[PDB]
Design a protein around this nucleic acid. Structure first.
Ligand SMILES: [Mg+2]
Ligand SMILES: [Mg+2]
Ligand SMILES: [Mg+2]
Ligand SMILES: [Mg+2]
Ligand SMILES: [Mg+2]
Ligand SMILES: [Mg+2]
Ligand SMILES: [Mg+2]
Ligand SMILES: [Mg+2]
Ligand SMILES: [Mg+2]
Ligand SMILES: [Mg+2]
Ligand SMILES: [Mg+2]
Ligand SMILES: [Mg+2]
Ligand SMILES: [Mg+2]
Ligand SMILES: [Mg+2]
Ligand SMILES: [Mg+2]
Ligand SMILES: [Mg+2]
Ligand SMILES: [Mg+2]
Ligand SMILES: [Mg+2]
Ligand SMILES: [Mg+2]
Ligand SMILES: [Mg+2]
Ligand SMILES: [Mg+2]
Ligand SMILES: [Mg+2]
Ligand SMILES: [Mg+2]
Ligand SMILES: [Mg+2]
Ligand SMILES: [Mg+2]
Ligand SMILES: [Mg+2]
Ligand SMILES: [Mg+2]
Ligand SMILES: [Mg+2]
Ligand SMILES: [Mg+2]
Ligand SMILES: [Mg+2]
Ligand SMILES: [Mg+2]
Ligand SMILES: [Mg+2]
Ligand SMILES: [Mg+2]
Ligand SMILES: [Mg+2]
Ligand SMILES: [Mg+2]
Ligand SMILES: [Mg+2]
Ligand SMILES: [Mg+2]
Ligand SMILES: [Mg+2]
Ligand SMILES: [Mg+2]
Ligand SMILES: [Mg+2]
Ligand SMILES: [Mg+2]
Ligand SMILES: [Mg+2]
Ligand SMILES: [Mg+2]
Ligand SMILES: [Mg+2]
Ligand SMILES: [Mg+2]
Ligand SMILES: [Mg+2]
Ligand SMILES: [Mg+2]
Ligand SMILES: [Mg+2]
Ligand SMILES: [Mg+2]
Ligand SMILES: [Mg+2]
Ligand SMILES: [Mg+2]
Ligand SMILES: [Mg+2]
Ligand SMILES: [Mg+2]
Ligand SMILES: [Mg+2]
Ligand SMILES: [Mg+2]
Ligand SMILES: [Mg+2]
Ligand SMILES: [Mg+2]
Ligand SMILES: [Mg+2]
Ligand SMILES: [Mg+2]
Ligand SMILES: [Mg+2]
Ligand SMILES: [Mg+2]
Ligand SMILES: [Mg+2]
Ligand SMILES: [Mg+2]
Ligand SMILES: [Mg+2]
Ligand SMILES: [Mg+2]
Ligand SMILES: [Mg+2]
Ligand SMILES: [Mg+2]
Ligand SMILES: [Mg+2]
Ligand SMILES: [Mg+2]
Ligand SMILES: [Mg+2]
Ligand SMILES: [Mg+2]
Ligand SMILES: [Mg+2]
Ligand SMILES: [Mg+2]
Ligand SMILES: [Mg+2]
Ligand SMILES: [Mg+2]
Ligand SMILES: [Mg+2]
Ligand SMILES: [Mg+2]
Ligand SMILES: [Mg+2]
Ligand SMILES: [Mg+2]
Ligand SMILES: [Mg+2]
Ligand SMILES: [Mg+2]
Ligand SMILES: [Mg+2]
Ligand SMILES: [Mg+2]
Ligand SMILES: [Mg+2]
Ligand SMILES: [Mg+2]
Ligand SMILES: [Mg+2]
Ligand SMILES: [Mg+2]
Ligand SMILES: [Mg+2]
Ligand SMILES: [Mg+2]
Ligand SMILES: [Mg+2]
Ligand SMILES: [Mg+2]
Ligand SMILES: [Mg+2]
Ligand SMILES: [Mg+2]
Ligand SMILES: [Mg+2]
Ligand SMILES: [Mg+2]
Ligand SMILES: [Mg+2]
Ligand SMILES: [Mg+2]
Ligand SMILES: [Mg+2]
Ligand SMILES: [Mg+2]
Ligand SMILES: [Mg+2]
Ligand SMILES: [Mg+2]
Ligand SMILES: [Mg+2]
Lengths: 134, 101, 77, 96
RNA sequence: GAGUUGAAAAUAAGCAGAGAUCCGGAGAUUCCCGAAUAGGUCAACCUUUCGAACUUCUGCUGAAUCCAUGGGCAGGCAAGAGACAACCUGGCGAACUGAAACAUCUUAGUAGCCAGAGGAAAAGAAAGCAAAAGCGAUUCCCGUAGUAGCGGCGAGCGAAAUGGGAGCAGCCUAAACCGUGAAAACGGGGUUGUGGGAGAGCAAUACAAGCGUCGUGCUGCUAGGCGAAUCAGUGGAGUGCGGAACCCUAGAUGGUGAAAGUCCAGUAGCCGAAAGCAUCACUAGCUUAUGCUCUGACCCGAGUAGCAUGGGGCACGUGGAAUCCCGUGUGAAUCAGCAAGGACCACCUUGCAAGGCUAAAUACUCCUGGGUGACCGAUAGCGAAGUAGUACCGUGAGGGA
RNA sequence: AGUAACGCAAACAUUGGUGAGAAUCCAAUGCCCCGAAAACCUAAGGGUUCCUCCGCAAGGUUCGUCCACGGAGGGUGAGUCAGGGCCUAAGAUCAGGCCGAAAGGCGUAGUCGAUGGACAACAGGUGAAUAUUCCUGUACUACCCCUUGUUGGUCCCGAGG
RNA sequence: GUAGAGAAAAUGCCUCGAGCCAAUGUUCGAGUACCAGGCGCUACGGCGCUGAAGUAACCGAUGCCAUACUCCCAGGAAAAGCUCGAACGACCUUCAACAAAAGGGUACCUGUACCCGAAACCGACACAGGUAGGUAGGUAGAGAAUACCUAGGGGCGCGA
């Protein structure tokens, strides 16, 4: 499978080298590049080695699956394929615009993210609880 | 929050109590290793939890010994001693529940 | 080794030279002797290998000066 | 005279690694009343006898060791004829 | 600051905003072999009275033998031992080759081996150069110079002084003498050269200079954080194209379906260290210290220098052969001296051997962190872009895709 | 060059069977060869080649349903057998010791070193793959345990063997 | 038993002993063991069930007594276990140690598969070769030669 050189890069302690990237899981984004350009969505899984993200209705691929279990029954499934994090921008639903993202400090002693075309705060204090309970 | 709690609990015990506790733990670890092979359903997380518990205990023990003023050689000697004097006793956890039953 | 303890003499590295100028490796050796020497301050002899120069020096400065410069205890000898 | 030094220094709780369950062993239980236990290579017979004698609380007749071509010690533990094997087979989870 | 349990999916369970996984500092554990070190062995095992063997260290004990030596016993986180690419120092030390043969000579004090120590080592504070004018420990580069010379006067080897730079730094001790002993030692005094010191008297005294526990200091390193600016169209995908805009203390770099200052990570700029490390300042303290006059009687590094022989090395091959350093044998002089100035003698100049220690400038790459490349792009570049010192071959050293 | 060869001149044959496919795989019946081996076992060596199930790319001098091949899963049980916990030979290392540019060389006690000395187990059964090892019978060494009998035993040393 | 510095030993003198030696043999171990057949099943592979007789003679080892003999010259390992024992030295000492016949108990590591006159080791090969030891049936034969056979194993990995 994995072309032997396309495997995961490594530190001396054997742990893979993670790209840092600008997005989280619960987020909503708009797709800037690729055939999926323009479509809006929400992010499910994110792989921090390749720097790639997966979005529920987007980048659909038609996969043939062979179920041989005493009979031959096949399945044609449509899955979602990872797309590169540089192809998406954070999307504001309110003023309905996709922007870049800066960091800001809130008086709570907190550090958060905001869209720089609006000034709209992205991260909610309970966001992680909201996603865990899902 | 289990970690901080457990450590505060550890540093407040005595030496003998630590020893005994350690033994009991290693035993439970044994019984666990038995269940694995029996293919009786159990928790994969448990090996980790227990092993690391034992670790933390030993660490504390040694860290005290260092305050007392003891070296590496003295350490290892008294350790051989303690491992010689070890007798197996049946684990209080699950073997006592087949003694009763 | 061929070495005097007391003066630290070494065998010297020297070419034997013929009438023909043809050189050859050779060793000149220290003149070493197995001697007993009287030690007055020990009331007793000491068996030693000595260079002869050392024997001389022992006549001149006395044994103890020599052994103290060379750092060798007559007791352990 | 002195303290009885165990043949090596091991820690007894790691010596009995596991029961070996295959078609083979089970009938050694049935016929011989003999358990089958993979143990630490560095472990001896006296160590194994004390270990099982105290742990499951059964008196053990005789122990036979073995060393696999893979370097893993394997022990036949034949208990006494008072203690039935299948007892410990149910107690442990080895079902004949 | 959000997901995580290596490569590496899948499965199973956990751990996680009272902060996980992760990154850095300091600790902890570290089976068996290996210096291997309780004793043994056929490395990775055995036997054990459970022991760091042996050598140094501290104490107790005390053979032949009075003092001693040896031995015995005990203490001790206990100094060493082994490993290490190249460079370096010492020790041994070739041969092919060149000379159109070869022996003196060359190769070359090279390779190799052995031992040793360091981040550099070695050398080093004038018994030195020079020449009648002067310099002022050592090392390194340029030059003098392929000069003077050496040489079966063949092949070849080959300086130095003046001159220019790099870099700078000077210190401890022996003896005379005064204390303490029966000594051997210890304590003060004393260290220099167009002479010092000891000796005997009279003056000056406070600053100056060198070293350095402790500690907030300064800076840097070892994790990090903030960080400007774009859209639609174009045939799989646009960073390209045509058309509009904008940032720039940022147009380094890497990635992104296709080439991007404006998409991501970043860059300029700017913040940031509980802990450890490093250079620096400060840091109680510790060190030292001057001045003149008289006195050739006291000292100024002895089996040493020299001499006779045998050699070695100096550019220098015994030559008229100094200087330097060694085998054998002899063997001085103390400053009214001794050595050097290319046999030797006279005169003058210069210097103070036979006790030690010292930073930098210079050499190197098993490597670490940055950077560049008229360097390679899978027959290349490392032997090695995948099990690479692997497979395989060899009893073995070794070879090796 | 689709040529030489296919590794002895012990010899195969037929009927069934399995299978997509059989001169070659299994079984039966003949026939033939070895039998101081071409039998059975053990030392050394090899290293999992052993057994079962699956497979038929490569290997196998043809074939292949088969295999010492590939894939999975198993398998080696000791007081008495063999070594070590006993003893020494040749030889090796060698505390101290003697010598040696260095590395080292010689060498005494010591300690290693079996191919030898010492020392206790056999029959039957089970058996996909182990058996003087597991089972059932009778045995035998070495310790420990108690009773009884004595008071000194232990090593170092002297000897016989 | 005695003697000499003399415990044991060696050595000298005195004494008591006619038997001794060891393969093998008889008996227990040992029979409701094993086994020819017999009965029944057949997954037609193997399995369950009951079992008669189990003695004698003659050949006869290269094996055992046996380091038993006789002869020869070339003159044929050491040390420990083992048996015996005073002085010297060290250490330990009373329910401590040693001495005994029974009785009960107790039981260290490592090898153990397979091949081994070989297709698995050694020969680069599934190679007409090399490889220590053990066991040694029948008929003929002086014989472990040869021929033909048993047990057991094979028909040589190209055929027609
Ligand atoms: Mg693939
Ligand atoms: Mg793109
Ligand atoms: Mg079995
Ligand atoms: Mg075994
Ligand atoms: Mg570690
Ligand atoms: Mg272990
Ligand atoms: Mg050792
Ligand atoms: Mg050793
Ligand atoms: Mg004393
Ligand atoms: Mg005395
Ligand atoms: Mg002494
Ligand atoms: Mg000691
Ligand atoms: Mg060293
Ligand atoms: Mg070395
Ligand atoms: Mg070093
Ligand atoms: Mg030559
Ligand atoms: Mg020549
Ligand atoms: Mg020539
Ligand atoms: Mg020539
Ligand atoms: Mg430097
Ligand atoms: Mg130096
Ligand atoms: Mg100076
Ligand atoms: Mg000077
Ligand atoms: Mg100059
Ligand atoms: Mg300058
Ligand atoms: Mg200067
Ligand atoms: Mg003095
Ligand atoms: Mg002074
Ligand atoms: Mg002068
Ligand atoms: Mg003067
Ligand atoms: Mg004075
Ligand atoms: Mg940023
Ligand atoms: Mg940006
Ligand atoms: Mg565009
Ligand atoms: Mg454009
Ligand atoms: Mg992109
Ligand atoms: Mg770019
Ligand atoms: Mg920066
Ligand atoms: Mg004077
Ligand atoms: Mg001379
Ligand atoms: Mg010369
Ligand atoms: Mg000369
Ligand atoms: Mg000179
Ligand atoms: Mg000169
Ligand atoms: Mg010399
Ligand atoms: Mg001389
Ligand atoms: Mg003089
Ligand atoms: Mg001279
Ligand atoms: Mg001079
Ligand atoms: Mg002088
Ligand atoms: Mg001189
Ligand atoms: Mg000097
Ligand atoms: Mg020096
Ligand atoms: Mg290629
Ligand atoms: Mg290559
Ligand atoms: Mg190519
Ligand atoms: Mg032809
Ligand atoms: Mg033809
Ligand atoms: Mg043909
Ligand atoms: Mg042929
Ligand atoms: Mg054939
Ligand atoms: Mg025949
Ligand atoms: Mg065969
Ligand atoms: Mg066989
Ligand atoms: Mg074998
Ligand atoms: Mg295999
Ligand atoms: Mg097979
Ligand atoms: Mg095939
Ligand atoms: Mg074929
Ligand atoms: Mg088939
Ligand atoms: Mg196979
Ligand atoms: Mg010998
Ligand atoms: Mg030697
Ligand atoms: Mg020695
Ligand atoms: Mg010896
Ligand atoms: Mg041995
Ligand atoms: Mg043997
Ligand atoms: Mg034995
Ligand atoms: Mg035996
Ligand atoms: Mg078998
Ligand atoms: Mg049997
Ligand atoms: Mg029987
Ligand atoms: Mg017995
Ligand atoms: Mg004896
Ligand atoms: Mg007697
Ligand atoms: Mg008597
Ligand atoms: Mg007698
Ligand atoms: Mg007869
Ligand atoms: Mg014969
Ligand atoms: Mg005889
Ligand atoms: Mg006595
Ligand atoms: Mg007795
Ligand atoms: Mg076996
Ligand atoms: Mg076998
Ligand atoms: Mg053969
Ligand atoms: Mg064949
Ligand atoms: Mg063959
Ligand atoms: Mg016959
Ligand atoms: Mg005949
Ligand atoms: Mg006959
Ligand atoms: Mg025959
Ligand atoms: Mg037959």
């Amino acid at each position: 499978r994995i072309k032997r050189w396309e495997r995961k890069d490594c530190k001396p302690n054997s742990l893979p080298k993670l790209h840092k990237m600008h997005v989280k899981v619960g987020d909503t984004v708009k797709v800037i590049s690729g055939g999926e350009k323009g479509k809006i969505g929400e992010i499910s899984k994110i792989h921090k080695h390749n720097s790639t993200v997966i979005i529920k209705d987007l980048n659909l691929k038609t996969k043939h699956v062979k179920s041989k279990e005493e009979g031959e029954q096949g399945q044609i499934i449509k899955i979602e394929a990872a797309i590169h994090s540089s192809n998406v921008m954070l999307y504001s639903k309110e003023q309905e615009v996709a922007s870049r993202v800066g960091h800001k400090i809130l008086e709570d002693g907190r550090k958060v993210r905001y869209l720089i075309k609006t000034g709209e705060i992205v991260d909610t204090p309970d966001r992680w609880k909201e996603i865990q309970n899902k | 929050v289990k970690k901080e709690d457990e450590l505060k609990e550890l540093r407040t015990k005595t030496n003998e109590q630590l020893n005994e506790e350690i033994l009991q733990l290693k035993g439970e670890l044994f019984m666990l290793r038995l269940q694995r092979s029996a293919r009786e359903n159990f928790k994969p997380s448990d090996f980790g939890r227990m092993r690391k518990r034992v670790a933390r205990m030993l660490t504390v023990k040694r860290e005290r010994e260092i305050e007392q003023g003891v070296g590496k050689r003295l350490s290892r000697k008294l350790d051989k001693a303690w491992k010689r004097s070890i007798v197996v006793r049946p684990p209080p956890s699950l073997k006592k529940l087949q003694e009763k039953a | 080794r061929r070495i005097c303890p007391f003066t630290g003499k070494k065998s010297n590295k020297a070419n034997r030279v013929s009438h023909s100028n043809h050189k050859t490796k050779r060793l000149q050796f220290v003149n070493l002797q197995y001697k007993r020497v009287w030690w007055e301050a020990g009331k007793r002899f000491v068996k030693l290998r000595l260079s002869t120069k050392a024997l001389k020096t022992i006549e001149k400065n006395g044994l103890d000066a020599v052994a103290k410069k060379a750092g060798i205890d007559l007791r352990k000898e | 005279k002195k303290l009885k030094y165990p043949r090596r220094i091991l820690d007894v709780y790691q010596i009995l690694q596991s029961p070996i369950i295959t078609e083979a062993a089970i009938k050694n239980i049935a016929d011989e009343n003999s358990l089958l236990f993979t143990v630490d290579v560095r472990a001896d017979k006296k160590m194994i006898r004390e270990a099982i004698s105290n742990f499951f609380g059964v008196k053990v007749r005789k122990v036979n060791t073995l060393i696999r071509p893979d370097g893993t010690k394997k022990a036949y533990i034949m208990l006494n004829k008072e203690y039935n094997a299948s007892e410990l087979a149910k107690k442990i989870g080895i079902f004949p």
